[PDB]
Design a protein around this ligand. Structure first.
Ligand SMILES: [Ca+2]
Ligand SMILES: [Ca+2]
Ligand SMILES: [Ca+2]
Lengths: 377, 380, 375
């Protein structure tokens, strides 16, 4: 009666739950299948899309903008993010863990300055025109796509650029100098240098990128570490009412059963393997079990209030976006810290469970560690 | 053009428009049929649900949390509301009229500390995961439901509680019969008093804390006379209400009293009958003739007054109803008769002259005939 | 290529409006639902647009609607009176004036001019149902019963403290009732409620974007714009308003609004508009074109590139939804040209020609925003 694997509606595997928007020899862009189409239980995520981006060393994703706000996050590798504005531009160096909100319609390009490592990015998108999807407008002209400038008539273009259409087509379109093949190209090492010296490394600005990784972990012991930034801590995060998390776990570590009070969590596996257990209510009852094994790039959604537990089967790190973030309270159901069960009066425990109240409190204090424990032990 | 009784889409009778979520000898929890499913004319109430809870003396609603924001209101009686947080807990004693916003996901339990009076509660619910409904997660293990802790596997449970499953199952699940029968149990006085010790009181004389239970009945009525009185708290005056953009009303009317025709400018009102009976007249527009919506209201019935729709209420017995005003911010109640808050009496003569058949003279005259305000006698 | 009536972003005065009421003294029309014509602008589903036109010395009878209104005077003059529970406020509205009318506010409208017509466009935000609103007229005419008629004899008698007969005579009169919701007033009358009114909570009264410094301005056109960050009423609605003047033969350079969904209407004149979308295997652009005439409405989705040719002297007004911090990115010219902010190395690979050449072309056009439609 359990919902496991690809039958688990909260599981979005990279193997079967993504759609490739673009892919070539240098990298790819993939968009996660819609949340609400997979399950009505997370219908309120219908206004969010998730994009995964990967590109090989010394690559560049060409200038483009979208009718969607983006909360870009670097899961693995390093990158140069340049936001191009109407009368200025800003380049930033994003290290693993760095996040940055990109207002909708902001033209931008991305570089993987690393000479040997791939760049992996996870991006939360909030569409503007249609609540369920957005469009990527590439200003560039490649064999894979026409520049949107091509949408204007000859007369408009000639009067706009104060030039003959033959020069315009020759220089910008190349649709009788040759154009690149796709929206992800490889740059010469020297070129990466020029772009690199102009970028600014992040050392909570309303604009500049931030790294939750270099803040004090909210939870930290021998089995795991948990970094988290909330809208209370960051203005970009407050605008989106979203919190972000980055958690490390050693092989054999267990993230104890817990539930987020009001936040809907979208998590992604950065590296490692994990077994996750989610509890829902069956459908005047009985609990509905949702199980899944997560691997690199897999996405999983933890609905607000649904109890959850994660067992790391290998060293692991996962990232998470918390929707409806403001004042979320993480309620643990075991351990000696943030444990809501330990906050219930003896008299209430007496009637809430079969055994006596004192017999329940005794069992509750058994586990002396908090948040992360030995999966065995 | 007269939709009345159970054919009135804005009427949600206690009799046919509720679904029982749980019921037993000590009390029951019911949820109103979805608003949007009844009428597209109130489509924007789709993200709201309404729950009615009623329990006997000395009872307790076991600890649980829900994926929905709650605006809990004690319609009748008194209760101890305890909010159990990750690392602490707060208890409050709620007298009739008290309201408190319970953030989504907050584990809480509820007790009727009164020895002879029932506890009647009405909750405005705003679901988080799905806009149309929420789930109730009970931590307890009873014959009626499994603890959500059961959803986890034995290995996770053992590791989590650092104990053998044999013990865990016996202590928390047990499926002699040690478990209670349902999610609402009866407690002994000693237990009640013990759950009362740290419970805080609002105390009108004291200085209130914006994040704790508040009672609109301890404030000065906005309207008040021989026939009825109206208490009201708005988001402008309360942060909990502001976060929800909702106002709350508590209206007292004596038998034979008429609540004059009026309309709320922008708030969509969900009203519920606390005690008594009344006849309601709501005015809508047909798809230009007017469309009439009438209903006879009694205890626990819910009725929706769409924003801008004119409405009048006639109390056929002493009455008290409570109301939730959605899209509340800066709402302006426009009365259509009487000598106060009457929008008509604010229309220049020349405009009244062409607006109605008679001269602006005769019209302004008919307007000033009623010297009462808000509440008048229903049978002069 | 989608053009004319086949362009889903084009909402013509000729066939995309529905008349709510019309008589010899004026009419009220509401635009067909945006989302019903195109899913590309589904997020405009909670908005409606109404066009109001009344001749000299007319009055729109007192009424209220379960919808927030942002009323704009396209052409003409007007007296807007907001009738509250315990008071009333009259405002003189000149061409270009805008005023927000909170939902449920009873108001009446007068065209005090002797010859000029009153033309208004209203942005509406429904309260009870997201897709439409109800207009409640207090008045009693041959076209509509007063909503008071909805209450019973007993309620009415007790409410007004009078026998029904008098009530039914003074208010309903099914010395008779007018023909419709728009009536003509004698000059004497106009003068009356005219002198009471007030022209030119301060930041809660009508405002006029044309009394501000144009954001862009030259010999070919000028652009007046008021955003949420400059007006409280606009901030509540998260809407910006625009008034653009263009002389015949002028070209508004290719550009796009970063996050604002724009609803524009042609006040006077005619224009040619070119919008760029994407088709949905080389990815091709989708061209949306149309000729915009008086009262026509056209929607520019956020992020969609657009350009406009004024084929006659022209003025258009626009509503910007999701306005907060909108960034208008121009794609040519000197000022606000995002292409000129792209580094040489990046341009080098984004286009066929070399970076230096791309840069040379981009700088060829030294003029900004508005230019002559001639190279
Ligand atoms: Ca027990
Ligand atoms: Ca008359
Ligand atoms: Ca090139």
């Amino acid at each position: 009666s359990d919902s496991r694997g690809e039958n688990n509606p909260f599981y979005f595997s990279s193997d079967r739950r993504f759609h490739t928007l673009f892919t070539n020899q240098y990298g790819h862009l993939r968009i996660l299948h819609r949340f609400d189409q997979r399950s009505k239980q997370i219908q309120n995520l219908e206004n969010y899309r998730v994009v995964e981006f990967k590109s090989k060393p010394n690559t560049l994703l060409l200038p483009h903008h979208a009718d969607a706000d983006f909360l870009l996050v670097v899961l693995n590798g390093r990158a140069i993010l340049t936001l191009v504005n109407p009368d200025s531009r800003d380049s930033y160096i994003l290290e693993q863990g760095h996040a940055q909100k990109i207002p909708a319609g902001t033209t931008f390009f991305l570089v993987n300055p690393d000479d040997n490592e791939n760049l992996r990015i996870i991006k939360l998108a909030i569409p503007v025109n249609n609540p369920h999807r957005f469009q990527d407008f590439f200003l560039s002209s490649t064999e894979a796509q026409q520049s949107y400038l091509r949408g204007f008539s000859k007369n408009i273009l000639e009067a706009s650029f104060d030039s003959d259409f033959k020069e315009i087509n020759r220089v910008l379109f190349g649709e009788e100098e040759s154009r690149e093949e796709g929206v992800i190209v490889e740059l010469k090492r020297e070129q990466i240098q020029e772009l690199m010296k102009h970028a600014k490394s992040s050392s909570s600005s309303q604009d500049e990128p931030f790294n939750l990784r270099n803040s004090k972990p909210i939870y930290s012991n021998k089995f795991g570490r948990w970094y988290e930034m909330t809208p209370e801590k960051n203005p970009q995060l407050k605008d989106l009412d979203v919190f972000i998390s980055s958690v490390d776990m050693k092989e054999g570590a267990l993230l104890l059963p817990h539930y987020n009070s009001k936040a809907i969590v979208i998590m992604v596996i950065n590296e490692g393997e994990a077994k996750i257990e989610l509890v829902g209510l069956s459908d005047e009852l009985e609990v509905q079990r949702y199980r899944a094994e997560l691997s690199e790039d897999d996405v999983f959604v933890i609905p607000a209030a649904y109890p959850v537990a994660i067992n790391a089967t290998s060293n692991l790190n996962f990232f998470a976006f918390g929707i409806n973030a403001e004042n979320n309270q993480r309620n643990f159901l075991a351990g000696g810290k943030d444990n809501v069960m330990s906050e219930i009066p003896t008299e209430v425990l007496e009637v809430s469970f079969p055994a006596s109240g004192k017999k329940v409190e005794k069992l509750i204090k058994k586990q002396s560690e908090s948040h992360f424990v030995d999966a065995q032990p």
